[PDB]
Design a protein around this motif. Structure first.
Motif, PDB file in Angstrom:
ATOM      1  N   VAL A   3       0.800  -1.288   0.000  1.00 54.97           N
ATOM      2  CA  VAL A   3       0.000   0.000   0.000  1.00 54.97           C
ATOM      3  C   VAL A   3       0.814   1.310   0.000  1.00 54.97           C
ATOM      4  O   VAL A   3       2.031   1.288   0.170  1.00 54.97           O
ATOM      5  CB  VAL A   3      -0.822  -0.099   1.264  1.00 54.97           C
ATOM      6  CG1 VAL A   3      -1.474  -1.475   1.346  1.00 54.97           C
ATOM      7  CG2 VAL A   3       0.068   0.144   2.477  1.00 54.97           C
ATOM      8  N   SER A  20      -7.345   2.836   5.685  1.00 55.69           N
ATOM      9  CA  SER A  20      -8.300   1.781   5.380  1.00 55.69           C
ATOM     10  C   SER A  20      -7.578   0.677   4.588  1.00 55.69           C
ATOM     11  O   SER A  20      -7.751  -0.512   4.865  1.00 55.69           O
ATOM     12  CB  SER A  20      -9.462   2.361   4.560  1.00 55.69           C
ATOM     13  OG  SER A  20     -10.416   1.370   4.220  1.00 55.69           O
ATOM     14  N   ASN A  21      -6.764   1.078   3.614  1.00 57.44           N
ATOM     15  CA  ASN A  21      -6.006   0.130   2.793  1.00 57.44           C
ATOM     16  C   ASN A  21      -4.910  -0.572   3.606  1.00 57.44           C
ATOM     17  O   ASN A  21      -4.603  -1.743   3.369  1.00 57.44           O
ATOM     18  CB  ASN A  21      -5.373   0.847   1.590  1.00 57.44           C
ATOM     19  CG  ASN A  21      -6.393   1.233   0.521  1.00 57.44           C
ATOM     20  OD1 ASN A  21      -6.150   2.135  -0.285  1.00 57.44           O
ATOM     21  ND2 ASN A  21      -7.525   0.541   0.497  1.00 57.44           N
ATOM     22  N   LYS A  24      -6.479  -3.311   5.539  1.00 56.78           N
ATOM     23  CA  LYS A  24      -6.866  -4.383   4.632  1.00 56.78           C
ATOM     24  C   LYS A  24      -5.720  -5.296   4.232  1.00 56.78           C
ATOM     25  O   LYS A  24      -5.936  -6.463   3.891  1.00 56.78           O
ATOM     26  CB  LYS A  24      -7.495  -3.803   3.371  1.00 56.78           C
ATOM     27  CG  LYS A  24      -8.950  -3.454   3.523  1.00 56.78           C
ATOM     28  CD  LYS A  24      -9.446  -2.706   2.300  1.00 56.78           C
ATOM     29  CE  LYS A  24     -10.937  -2.439   2.382  1.00 56.78           C
ATOM     30  NZ  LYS A  24     -11.360  -1.527   1.285  1.00 56.78           N
ATOM     31  N   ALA A  25      -4.504  -4.766   4.253  1.00 58.07           N
ATOM     32  CA  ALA A  25      -3.349  -5.562   3.881  1.00 58.07           C
ATOM     33  C   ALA A  25      -2.924  -6.489   5.016  1.00 58.07           C
ATOM     34  O   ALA A  25      -2.059  -7.346   4.838  1.00 58.07           O
ATOM     35  CB  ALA A  25      -2.195  -4.650   3.483  1.00 58.07           C
TER      36      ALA A  25
END
Length: 247
Positions: A3, A20-21, A24-25
């Motif tokens: 990211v 947010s990303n 998610k990772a």
């Protein structure tokens, strides 16, 4: 999953999108009270992910993190890699930034105690906010040794701490054009992630009750004792749990 976050043109939204990303990772098999529970451990080839940060001047550094606990192992700037002086980083160096022909071992490990000593400043004396992140990137990009420690502390709170707590995410992300000194409410959350994570996991099989209380500091500087998952920090703040198996 790689990211990234760009300071050029950044907004509260774009920072939120980045955080947010980042979350998610981070892999997870389960969630407790809708909060993702981080993996107990992972094989070296799955254990690390990269965070590409670009400052205003369009200069970029890649930060390596352990995805089981969101810890920063080091970062890379051009052809030079920089690792914390600890067993964790030494291990990560075997998997990340392996094509960087210049490897530097920072004179300190990555925990606050070590960093604050190297910086001669504690977290609360160091400004945060997007402009603070930009400046931190610059000092790390050119490795300004005498400012790297504090800069790393800005980086950690802007990534790791922000990923763990929505509140910290909000505070840092709102400071788009100005900086601020972090409150004890923020530091309190940073110092209690392991404890909160542990107690919430215990709670999941203990009627939602903590085994031991966790004391935090609110915005009014008062101590607030947490004893169950009905507390606001559990319902509407903590966004990741460190596994009991993984400190």
């Amino acid at each position: 999953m790689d990211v990234s976050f760009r300071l050029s043109g950044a907004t509260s939204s774009s920072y939120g999108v980045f955080i947010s990303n980042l979350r998610k990772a981070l892999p997870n098999e389960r969630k407790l009270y809708d909060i993702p529970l981080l993996r107990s451990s992972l094989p070296g080839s799955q254990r690390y992910a990269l965070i590409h940060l670009t400052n205003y001047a369009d200069e970029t550094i890649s930060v390596a993190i352990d995805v089981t606990n969101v810890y920063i192992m080091g970062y890379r700037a051009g052809d030079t890699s920089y690792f914390f002086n600890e067993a964790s980083a030494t291990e990560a160096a075997k998997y990340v930034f392996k094509d960087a022909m210049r490897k530097v071992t920072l004179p300190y490990s990555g925990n606050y105690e070590r960093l604050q000593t190297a910086a001669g400043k504690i977290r609360e004396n160091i400004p945060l906010g997007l402009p603070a992140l930009d400046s931190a990137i610059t000092t790390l990009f050119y490795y300004n040794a005498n400012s790297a420690a504090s800069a790393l502390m800005v980086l950690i709170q802007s990534t790791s701490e922000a990923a763990r707590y929505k509140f910290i995410e909000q505070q840092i992300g709102a400071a788009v054009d100005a900086t601020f000194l972090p409150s004890l409410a923020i530091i309190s959350l940073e110092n209690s992630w392991s404890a909160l994570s542990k107690q919430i996991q215990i709670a999941s099989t203990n009627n939602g009750q903590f085994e031991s209380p966790v004391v935090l500091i609110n915005a009014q500087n008062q101590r607030v004792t947490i004893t169950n998952v009905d507390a606001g920090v559990v319902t509407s703040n903590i966004a990741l749990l460190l596994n009991r198996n993984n400190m």
